Design a protein around this nucleic acid. Structure first.
Length: 273
RNA sequence: CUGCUGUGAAUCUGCCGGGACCACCCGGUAAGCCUGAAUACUUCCCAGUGACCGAUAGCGGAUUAGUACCGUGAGGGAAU
RNA sequence: UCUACCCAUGGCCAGGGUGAAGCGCGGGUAAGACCGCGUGGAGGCCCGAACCCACUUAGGUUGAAGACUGAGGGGAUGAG
RNA sequence: GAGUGAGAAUGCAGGCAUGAGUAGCGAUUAGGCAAGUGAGAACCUUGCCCGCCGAAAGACCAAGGGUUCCUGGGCCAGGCCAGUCCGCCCAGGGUGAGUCGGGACCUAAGGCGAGGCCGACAGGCGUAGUCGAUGGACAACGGGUUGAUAUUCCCGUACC
RNA sequence: GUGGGGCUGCAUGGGACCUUCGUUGGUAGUAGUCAAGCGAUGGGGUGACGCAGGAAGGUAGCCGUACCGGUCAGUGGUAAUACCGGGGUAAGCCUGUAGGGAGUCAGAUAGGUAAAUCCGUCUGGCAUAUAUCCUGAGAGGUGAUGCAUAGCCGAGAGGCGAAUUCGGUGAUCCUAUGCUGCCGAGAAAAGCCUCUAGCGAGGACAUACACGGCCCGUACCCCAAACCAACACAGGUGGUCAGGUAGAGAAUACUAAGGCGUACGAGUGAACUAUGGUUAAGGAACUCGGCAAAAUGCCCCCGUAACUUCGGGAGAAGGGGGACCCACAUGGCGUGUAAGCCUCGGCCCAAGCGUGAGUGGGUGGCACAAACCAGUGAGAAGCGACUGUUUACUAAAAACACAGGUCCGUGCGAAGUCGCAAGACGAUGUAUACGGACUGACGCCUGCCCGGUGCUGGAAGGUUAAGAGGACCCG
RNA sequence: AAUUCCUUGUCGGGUAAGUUCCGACCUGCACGAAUGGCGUAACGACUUCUCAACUGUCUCAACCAUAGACUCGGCGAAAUUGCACUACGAGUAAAGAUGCUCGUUACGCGCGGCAGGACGAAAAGACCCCGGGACCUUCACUACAACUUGGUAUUGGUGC
RNA sequence: UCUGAUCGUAUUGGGCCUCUAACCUCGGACCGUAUAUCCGGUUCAGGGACAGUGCCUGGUGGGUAGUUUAACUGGGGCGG
RNA sequence: UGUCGCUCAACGGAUAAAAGGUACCCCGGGGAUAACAGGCUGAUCUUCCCCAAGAGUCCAUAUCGACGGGAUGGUUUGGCACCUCGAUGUCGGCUCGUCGCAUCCUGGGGCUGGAGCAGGUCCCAAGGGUUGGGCUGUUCGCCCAUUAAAGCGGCACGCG
């Protein structure tokens, strides 16, 4: 966190991430694939996700999330690199082999330090392992849901899963959301808590700083017309005049997995508060 | 009589119809396939006909006519 | 092909102020914290042309124009 | 036997009156004289003055237009007036590339999409591919001529 | 159940018999294999990218000038000591300057879907050199004994045609996709070079000569009477050049190059309307309302209040000087030649050429930012935090949005949405994330109520559909 | 009070005078806490009020110049239109008279100006009522999309 | 055989448990395929008679559609 | 054949089954029907009387005149719906006015509870005059300075 001095009215309550730990300004030519911003529109071209205006263009920087091969092959990080489309800095592994890859870069991962994938890995911050090998209680991330499928949980900034007791074939992983979902064991995970927890203390300061970042203005529901939202016109400031409701009339309740889904693994859901 | 979804048999003392349904009599032989004429129609061509029009009529169009023009476009659409 | 938003790829923004972080020096101290000085040139910063709008007023009001013209007006490195 | 009788439907098509020989004649630059051409001159042709634009009202392109360019001719149509003039009318001519802007080189967004999947049917998506510059790669400059073309023709020197 | 006795059986660590592996002895550096070159449709590098902003080097232009050609512009003065016009020339080819960037050689490895001498990666070695390589504005030479051009001539065409140095100023253009920052993290693919796979007995290079070079666009307009506007329409239209003198400037005033006088005129002091001008005395009395005008306005010094989120407010407010000539001044500053020194070199550098700012003395006017251009200021309240957005064509705001806040949903081909579905967006994202709802920075806060209506959970009761179940009844 | 009808509430300040403005009182018809409450530096072509300077806004208008207007020459429309050698008064009338009544005034035809009337032109009233549409809303009615419940088919063995 | 407690053999339903063979997997690896995150196939690893999709059936359902929403009335509305 | 099932009560009963908004509105109509003006009326309003109970030390009448009665005007709120809905533009202000007298000033007079100056009231009289500001969109009104005075009204609440 670094607070901008309140010089102009848009940098008053602003802050910008230090970006500390970033060894290199530019990503490797070999790994940075390209992705055009889609606009919030599917193949029919219609506004499908709303509020997704064009934002500075980005380049993809392939992280692989599986790392099944070369478990024994040690690695060393070379650089921690900034990534646009994560909420993270991404570490760059050179293997002994010399192939170059990208990791979502946990905390305490200095530049230079030796990590190792595979089954006889030591439990260090940074390295892959199945859930078979990890001692219960340690903080793991990336984990995944289905074996070989690749990392699909705890990928965000400073956000990590705690592995409670595995009991045979299933391991009870208690999510960042406090939800307790039993993955199977032969899935992998990456030991360590994910880096860059300093963000979300960022205020984006001014209005257009969240536009560069790709987000368009959100007209809230009341101001529109009766045609145009359930919270229609009225004559003055309407509260909504009805129970609060998605712009397509769907009630603001539930919306979780429909009944009869494959929720066998979910042994306890998150909480309201 | 016919579609979809379930159930689902019998071959002649069988089976189906005779306006719910049952009994007797009547009729017919399903779950297989073709089948001409009688009938409808007129882009085109021929031969005619008119108590049909005669150039604001008769086709939008007797004259460069779906032309000029109008319109992004579909489309509209003259006059002599 | 107008206009509303979005995607890809280009191009434009005369000129003049202001002086943030960082950096370098000096004071300070135990190091500090901090305080002056230079550098540096940030900003949905400032003044103002192109350019984009259209606030006020006058005209026009069978207009020069089926929405413009003149004097002023706002933005003008950015949500352009 | 009737498409059978109009004065009126803010009725339709053509024609023509009233307003009326009225209002206008489209800027913020401005014209004058001399001489000519001609039946005819405020406007056309030339000279001398005067004024206007000069980050344009100058010079070059894209797009779009279509011969409007040049030469000769014309002045019943048009030009908000007249016209000998014209961006108008007629007839003939004029547009020359290894290097410029493109294609034969390449892809972005996106379009189409073999098969394929989905779909009662029509069709909806999409993989390989294959198109798509507003971008990338690629070899040329200076002068001269025509009544009209010039990095195109020619001259001098180059490069792929 | 309690400890010590057991054989044997199972289980464990270690060396040895065979096997297998390791090692040297003759052969077998021979039967074996690669080695000219084109080298991929394959591999790898490169192509390969953002925004802001100086600083330096240049250069284009421009202004002067040595020098060349010329004029007497019927006036008071000026014969060349004044004035007018010249004072040019490109791509390429040489050199490799300023600037900018780079360690190189060997060995090992299968990581790059097969193979690699390439690319990675790890080891060592010698290196930090103004070395070498790469890139590269510009200067210089050549291109150019040509082409050009001021003028000269007779007379539309022809020919002749001198000098062609030096400074200064200065780009938004070039170096430059460079460099330093910064967060918002900035297309791919052909091309180019290399690597082997594979082709291969021919093939590469140099010099010369002779050749081939395809298709379309090419006129003319192009900020317009030729395009879109029904019109020879006061509107709209993207890019490239960017002269001078003042000026900070592409503002504006005049003006060069070049183009226009653009298509109803002649008049005439009517009223009145439109656009301009000026006004005694008063100065908002006008009026819905200081609307419209008028005023202020530039540069440098002095000066600055409450309040404050400590950044501002602020150019607050208010005030002074500004012209021309001369003196310090042959001074300074910039640039830099010849000479001077040192080791496409560097330093200073008389002169020249340019240019402030200030003190001092004057001079003149009514007026010295003299024209054009060019803030009105202050105090208070309401709403909105702000910069933005909006009803094209009567509403620009207090409305929208916003940064920030809370809640609800969402565990992942998620929720949500578009589609009949597959499929896609969300997102090549993973609860510090996405979606929805409200509020709208900041500061201090956000009280009570779950009865109604919703939402979330719970099945103990009542009440409830199809499906099974066919008593009794009827034909 | 962007909410307060009564209400120009009452008191205080500014003004010579203040239905607007600023501070306060509380009897809030009918403020009130994320449809947020109260504040608030900076910011506003926002709304309201006061002042300084300055002015034709005014007291109270004047003069000058352009472009129209006016005159002569050229081309030359338009909306409107039952007529026509289309006076005024007091009346009368579908209740506001150029046309009817009784009187009064007034030669014929133009031109430049001003706008009282022609219930002036334009737009088959935007208000109001009747009829019909539209679109929007909801505990109006009736359906449907979508979501969800159970059966049964796809669809089976095993044990309790 | 009865007023009724009961097993064992079939049928017939309800519930739960697990299994794998239907089916499902946007979970992997190979093949079509030189190219290919589509699709198809083989196999592994999982779910698993559940889900999904038919047919039947009850709910919620301004999300959406079609329409109704009286007349008298000293103009309508409110009242009656 | 006999009877039964409907606040079908909007009771001759449009369906077994149905509520609102529109200032975002639209279309067909209507002066059958409202708004603004005009017209009839005159409840109300305004001006003026008739009677005289009383107040006025006495005295009804100098001046007020209750309780009652009768009218004028057509200016207030109206009542009616006759003109106009195939269009009669609204309040204020400004500019320009013209008329009435039921006179605010000036002029002439009668009576006084008129000593004088100044008043009151009535009668005659419309020639001219009848201010400028503050607040309000304001008409009205309050106010501040004056004045001889700061008139009342009509004319589509005169005049777009």
């Amino acid at each position: 966190i670094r607070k901008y001095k309140p010089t102009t009215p848009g940098r008053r309550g602003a802050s910008v991430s230090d970006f500390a730990e970033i060894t290199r300004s530019t990503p490797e030519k070999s790994l940075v694939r390209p992705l055009h911003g889609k606009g919030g529109r599917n193949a029919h071209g219609r506004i499908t996700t709303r509020h997704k205006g064009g934002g500075h263009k980005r380049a993809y920087r392939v992280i692989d999330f599986r790392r099944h091969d070369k478990d024994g092959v040690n690695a060393k990080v070379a650089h921690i690199e900034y990534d646009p489309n994560r909420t993270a800095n991404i570490a760059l592994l050179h293997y002994l082999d010399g192939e170059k890859r990208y990791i979502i870069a946990p905390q305490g991962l200095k530049q230079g330090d030796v990590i190792e994938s595979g089954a006889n890995a030591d439990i260090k911050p940074g390295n892959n392992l199945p859930l078979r090998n990890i001692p219960a209680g340690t903080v793991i991330h990336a984990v995944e849901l289905r074996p070989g499928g690749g990392a699909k949980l705890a990928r965000s900034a400073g956000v990590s899963i705690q592995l409670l007791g595995k009991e045979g074939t299933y391991a009870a992983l208690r999510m960042p959301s406090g939800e307790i979902r039993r993955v199977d064991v032969r899935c992998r995970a990456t030991v360590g808590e994910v880096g860059n927890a300093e963000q979300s203390n960022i205020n984006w300061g001014k209005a257009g700083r969240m536009r560069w970042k790709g987000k368009r203005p959100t007209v809230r529901g009341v101001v529109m017309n009766p045609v145009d939202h359930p919270h229609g016109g009225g004559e003055g400031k309407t509260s909504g005049g009805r129970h609060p409701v998605s712009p397509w009339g769907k009630p603001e309740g539930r919306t979780r997995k429909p009944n009869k889904p494959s929720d066998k693994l979910i042994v306890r859901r998150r909480r309201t508060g």
